[PDB]
Every structure is written in C-alpha cells, then in structure tokens.
Assembly symmetry: C2
Homo-oligomer: 469 residues x 2
C-alpha cells in the first residue's frame, strides 16, 4: 500500500459531528483506583470540560476543579486529542501538564461513551510509567452535567404560570394556529364545521388563511402580529417579561473564552441554545434541527433577520400584513425550534423521543412540566417564548418608524381591543385582527381541533433543507 | 408571485464569502461633507471594524476612535447589516447608538467597495431622524482598509541571519534540495545522470531516496526531511534566538466574543496571524483550496488533528523515522507553508503580484530580501514564520523518540551525526547518512544548471506556488 501524496480538507462527517456533540460540554469527573490520582488535584469533585468545533475533528478541553476551570489562570491539565477512528466505543486524548512549563503529554486517556446526559468511563496511563510494568489501576468516570432547562433558570410566578398552562389557554393557542395554517387545505365540510363553532380564521365567509397562495396579501400577517401583542399585553400585566434587545449569540468556543463557554452550558439566563438531539428514524429532521441550532445558521439566517427587520428601507416596502406573514413563515418557526429542548414526559419530565399527537389531550400533557417550544399547545409556557416574541413585537415599531420616514402620515396609530395598534390604510389591510371567537369553551376547542386533525413537532412540519445540506 | 412557505439554511455562496472577506478587518475612517459628523465623535481619526462569519451573511462591526475600539467599554456606534443582494457595488449597514439606551438604528449607511491597487469603502451616511423629504444632506465617508502587516514587519531577523538566508547560494540550495527529492521519481535517466554529474542527486549515488515516489514512505526519504531542517535550525539558531511554536496559533477570535483581540489579530503583532486568502486569476480550484486551508474549520479539521497525532505516543510509536518524516512533509508541512503564506510580492518594491516566480527564473530581483514568499522554497526560509513551525516540527522528533522509548525501550539509540543530535540506524531509523546536498553525498551556477535540468528541460508554458502544486480539494469543497 502507498501513503497519501497530499492532504485534503477533512471536515467531520455526521458520525464525527454527533460524537463531538456528545462530548461538548461540562462533565463531573471522578477518579477510581489504587493509582488513581493526578498531581496537585483531588480524586473526587473534579470536572472535565470538552469542546469540538461544529465540523472539527480535534478534541480540546481542560481538567481541574470547578473553580479553577472558571478562573482566569490556566487550569492544571489541558486536553488534546483527535477523533480519527473514534466513536462511542473509543475516545482518546492526552493530558498536558500546564504547570510543568512543558506541553509534552503526561497522561494517556481512553474512554467509552454510554447513555445526566451521558457518561464517559475509562482508564488513564502515566506516560512516565513503562507499559512493561504491572497494569496500573487508574480509572475515571465522567458524568456530563444536565443542560438546565429554560424554566429551571427563568421562573414564571404562579399567577402568570397558572394562566399559561390552563387547558383553556393551551387549546386556544393550538387551535388559533391550527385553524390559520390548515384552512387552505381543509374541505368546506371542515370549514363549515369550524364556522359553526365560530373558530374560522378571521371574518366569517372572508377567512384569512395564513399559509395559502394569497397568504402574503390576505392580511393574515396582521392576525399574527396582533394576537401575540395581545398575549404580551396580558402576560406582562402579571410579570415583567422584557423583550430581547438583541438575539443571543452562539456559545463562544472554548479556545477563546473558557469561563464563558463553561457558563453557557449552565444556561444561566435561560437564553442558551439547547443542544440538538437525534430524532428516531428521521435523519432529515435531525439534520434540519442541528443546522438550525448551529452557529453558522445564526450568522446565515438569524443575524440576517435581525438586520432586515430593523432596516427602515427594508420595512418601508412591506404592509403590516406582508411583514407579519414574512416573519411568521420564516423567522418565527425557526425561533421556536432553535431554543427548543427535547420533549419531556409531562408527569415526571423525563426526556421522550416522540412528540405529542395533536389530537391527544390526555390530562398529563396539560401539566406545567410540558413547556415544549415545538408545539403551540405548550410553547407559550416556555420562558424563552416571551423573550423572542417580545423582540418580534418590538419590530412592529421599527415598521411604523420605517413608514413615518418614507411615507410620513400614511400609517396612523390607533387603540384596538385596548392595545396600541394602527388604523386601516394603505399599509394596514384590515382593522379586525383575529383573536378567536372573541373577535369573530374547552370541549368546543377539542372538537374543533379534532375536525382539523382527526411525526415531527408543529413548528417543524414545514421544514426544508438547503440544497447544500 | 408567491412568498416562501418556509425558511432554509442560507449559507453564503462563493460571491458572498469573498465579499465578507473583503469587508472583514480594521478600516481607517474619514468623514467628509458639511453635515459629516457622528454624535460625540471627531471627523478625522476614526476607525471602522467589520466582521462576517466564514459563511455568514450578516454584517457586524463597530465605529469609534482607535483607542475606544480596543477598550473594554462598548464602542460608541455598533454596525448591523446584511449582505443580501450586496456586492462591491452596494454594501449597506445601520449604525446603532449604544449610548442612547436603545438598539434602534440612528444612521443608514451605503457604500461601494474599490480595490485601487487592501481596499476602499466610500459612501454616504443618512441620519434616520432627518426626513428624506428635506434638502439632500452632505454626509460622505471614506474608509481605507488597513494594511495587513507582513511577518517580517513584526519579527525582525538580524543582519547576520538575514544575510545568510537571502544569499543566492542559500536560496538555490533550498530550492534544489526540494526540487531534486520531489521530482526524482518523474525524471528520466538523462536528467538523473545529469544531476549525478553535479552531485545533486537525492541521497547516496545510485541508491537515491526519492521523496514523492511509490516507496516514499519506506525509502528513508523522511529522514532526509527531518535532518536537513534540524541542521538548518541549528545553524540559524546560532545567529538568532528562534523559539519553536509550543502550540499552533489558533484562528482569529470572532469579533462577537473578543473585540480587542479581533482587532489586534489584524495587526499581526507576533507575526503569527494567518494572512487572509487571496483570489487567484483564472484558478478557482486553487482559490478555494487556499481559502479552506486558511479557514478556521481547517484548523479544527486538519491542523489540530496533526498537532494531536504528532504528540500522541501511541500514534508515533507505529512509525519509523522515515515513515514519520514522509507523512509529515507530504501533508502538514506543505499546508503549514500555504496557511501562513502572505501574497507573493515584487522583490523590487513589494507590490502584491498575482503571478508566482517561474522556478527556472533567476532574475537578480527575486534574490532581494523583500522576497520571503512561503510558497516557494527559493524564499520560504526567509520568512520568520518558517522557523516557528519548523521548530515545532523538529521538536516532534523528540516526541517520536519518547514514544519508542515507551513502547520499544532501547530500540532507538541517540547519536551525533554531522554535529547534530540525531539517532543511530536501526529498526526504526532506516539509514544513517542524511542528505544535506553535495556536502554529504556529492556552487551558484551549478545549482542553477541543475534546476534548469529539472524544470526547464521540457516546457514552461496553470501557475501555482511550489507548495500548492500537489493541491487536492475534498469532494465537498466544489
């Protein structure tokens, strides 16, 4: 056999990427064995921090006490390895003695990954010791620290929380979305049935489908913006819910800000991106969710949306309906899934792979534990829901200021349903935003939802991969 | 017409990537016009810092004085824009008044990008509080992208060492030493006998050690690679302190996480910054290859892997000294040269040049100290970075010795060879006569004549640097 004549760009494949995702994060480390000890370190209460670039194949990290990993001084031990030929069955890396003034490795580490979000267990070898000596007893078990959920870091008081998780509010939110999004694909038999219970989207016999051919010019976007502004108004009367001023930036890689990287995985402000998960027998959705949560998706899509929707020249070209429709079909769904964490069983919160069936109204799904962002039946319960929906709502004023600049006086402010809104005109197609039957009963909403429905999350049903993906 | 029913990952294409490359960096800003001013800022002496992710389409940055852009406090103005529909003919971004307690933009900027042979941005700024129906405002700006400092502009080589490196004898030696090894397997017997006649065959006569032939990994050619550069380090280090890299330099920290560090990186203070890729005329394959090789994901995918492997006892203990040298040269070595290679430059005045020196072109100007191009062994040894990563490589030989002392104790023996700390022949050291040129197995005009036999023998009329001639793109790159 002949060796390679040159090198090529060796970006990680799916297996290597997923492996790096399993390793990336903060681990609670424990050393076991008669010879299990590291110079100037205790045996228990240690931590291991690992990182791998989104498509990288090298492995970096540090090993020390929790306090020294967050300290500014270089940690005692540094991790250097690579994932060539690696897998859940074999991960290797060396430790570097950063206090010896030398980068030469002092230990050889090998581990196996088992599925608390994961476990690494293996052996450590002192490189100064000869392999011809009796096998040394130097083991370690590292447990990956739980990635804190949004509700574990942003607490919603009982009054607000009681209003969000109530069966009345959950079904309203789901049916309000379901009626808009499905109307264009419902038969008139289904339409007349929803009309019979007053749950048609918009004025009767003049309904405003949100995802049909004329979705951008039928004023459906106005129902989108207003309903959430109405939700923000009532929700903010029960608790201070500040909007995002800017979109959260992706995690800083470990090589440039070690404490910030470590702090990110504690989700301190609840605005961290939950790491993507792998869906059972659905690589298309797993790839889509992964990219949507990636850093390059922030720089390619989210950062663009943040720019466009604060650009007067860009907003002044859109009616309030065009703006709402454009933002809902693109940014809105992606916001939910970027910050979505895995669906948890409502009764105890254990991670579950399956998503709730839309017409499944078992009493457990209504528990406060279910705040899954991928389903409007529960997304409003997540604290992050209000942060980026406040951000969206604030962009309406950028839209108003955009037109006051290029079309002064053509858009008029006006109070609608006790909410700061705008009067109909050249840039406001309608003056009757749809808030459900109130503007145009639990068991009734269930019957309506059953008419519409009677496997991926709701906000992932329209997922589309790029040609390059 | 219909609007999109959903969104999709919108990574930048080649045009968008190159545009972001043109914008990324630090700019000296100048405001011109009767209404040209920004609140709480002077008109002259401003700077603009811009960044775009490797494949990002959003545009971020800051605008303030040089001192405040390097300060920890938030700069006065923040840039937010996007490159949808943008190009050298139109780039737009908004300014945010970070001192106003609001992220709402206060100005609207548009500019055109010129190169004016690193680039120029000129355009207009619009106060958003001012009505467009008002008299046309006079608010222009000209931003000049600051020169990316070269390695020799930040690491100074004393006259003695530098004089030893640029000498025509040393330049031709370095090129012919590489040329002989790398071309031998493709040379006719007429060309081989001709080199043998001048004592420039690679290795022992009639037992030459080609470096890129089928038996390149098992013919001990890698030992000639490691040793010659260790010999070069020894003599060079006797004239100037040339410390090796302990670790490989990390890619630039993005602007979003460390603004001063991002700005300092483009000053190349330690001479170890990665010169931004350039676009080759009528050679997209090479432009993509050079771009990826200089990218951050190439550091994490290739360089960081090499850095790990070549300090992994289990990995090194599986290689003889010849296998190790050959493997490292064919892969990491060439990539090291091109990753830190600044654009080739005219020796007489230093202006960036698109064409590379023809190997058999020995005009007297190429021998000037100005020519320290890393892509050509005729000049790579003159670049200060050359010695940093060749010291790193040389240090890995000791990791290899310790690897074998661990897994094969006593099977590798140290020994002084040609006054250099080396190793004796054995199971893991194929040969004991490293090739340093005619001195070990054998003149200016002679070296020129030999190079002409190798390069000028056929035709000269697809022009790439020496260390890029064996470039290979991954299936995903194009």
């Amino acid at each position: 056999p002949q060796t390679p004549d040159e090198a090529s760009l060796d970006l990680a494949a799916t297996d290597g990427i997923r492996l790096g995702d399993r390793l990336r994060g903060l681990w609670d480390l424990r050393l076991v064995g008669g010879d299990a000890e590291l110079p100037g370190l205790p045996r228990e209460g240690l931590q291991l921090v690992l990182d791998v670039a989104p498509k990288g194949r090298g492995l970096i990290g540090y090993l020390d006490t929790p306090e020294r990993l967050l300290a500014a001084e270089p940690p005692r031990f540094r991790v250097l390895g690579d994932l060539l030929g690696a897998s859940s069955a074999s991960i290797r890396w060396r430790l570097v003695d950063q206090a010896s003034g030398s980068v030469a490795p002092t230990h050889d580490c090998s581990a196996v990954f088992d599925e608390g979000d994961g476990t690494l267990s293996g052996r450590i070898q002192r490189l100064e010791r000869s392999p011809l000596s009796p096998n040394e007893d130097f083991r370690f078990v590292a447990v990956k620290r739980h990635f804190p959920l949004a509700h574990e870091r942003i607490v919603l008081n009982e009054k607000l929380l009681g209003w969000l998780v109530s069966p009345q509010h959950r079904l309203f939110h789901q049916l309000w979305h379901a009626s808009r999004d499905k109307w264009h694909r419902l038969s008139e038999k289904q339409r007349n049935a929803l009309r019979g219970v007053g749950w048609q989207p918009g004025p009767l016999d003049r309904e405003r489908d949100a995802r049909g051919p004329r979705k951008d010019r039928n004023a459906s976007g106005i129902d989108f913006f207003f309903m959430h502004r109405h939700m923000l108004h009532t929700a903010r009367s029960m608790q201070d819910l500040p909007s995002w001023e800017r979109l959260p930036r992706p995690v800083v890689p470990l090589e440039y800000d070690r404490p910030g990287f470590i702090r990110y995985f504690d989700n301190p402000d609840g605005f961290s991106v939950p790491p993507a998960w792998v869906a059972v027998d659905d690589d298309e959705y797993s790839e889509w969710l992964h990219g949507l949560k990636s850093a390059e998706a922030y720089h390619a899509n989210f950062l663009v949306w943040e720019s466009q929707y604060q650009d007067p020249a860009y907003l002044a070209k859109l009616t309030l309906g065009q703006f709402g429709s454009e933002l809902e079909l693109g940014m809105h769904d992606w916001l939910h899934m970027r910050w979505a964490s895995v669906t948890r069983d409502p009764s105890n919160g254990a991670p579950v792979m399956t998503d709730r069936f839309p017409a499944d109204f078992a009493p457990r799904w209504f528990r406060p534990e279910n705040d899954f962002l991928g389903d409007p039946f529960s997304s409003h319960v997540n604290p992050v829901f209000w942060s980026f929906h406040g951000w969206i709502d604030d962009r309406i004023e950028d839209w108003y200021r955009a037109h006051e600049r290029f079309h002064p006086g053509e858009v008029q402010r006006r109070e609608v349903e006790g909410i700061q809104w705008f009067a109909p005109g050249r840039w406001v197609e309608v003056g009757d935003p749809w808030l459900g039957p109130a503007t145009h009963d639990v068991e009734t909403m269930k019957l309506a939802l059953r008419i519409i429905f009677s496997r991926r999350p709701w906000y992932a049903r329209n997922l589309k991969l790029a040609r390059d993906q």
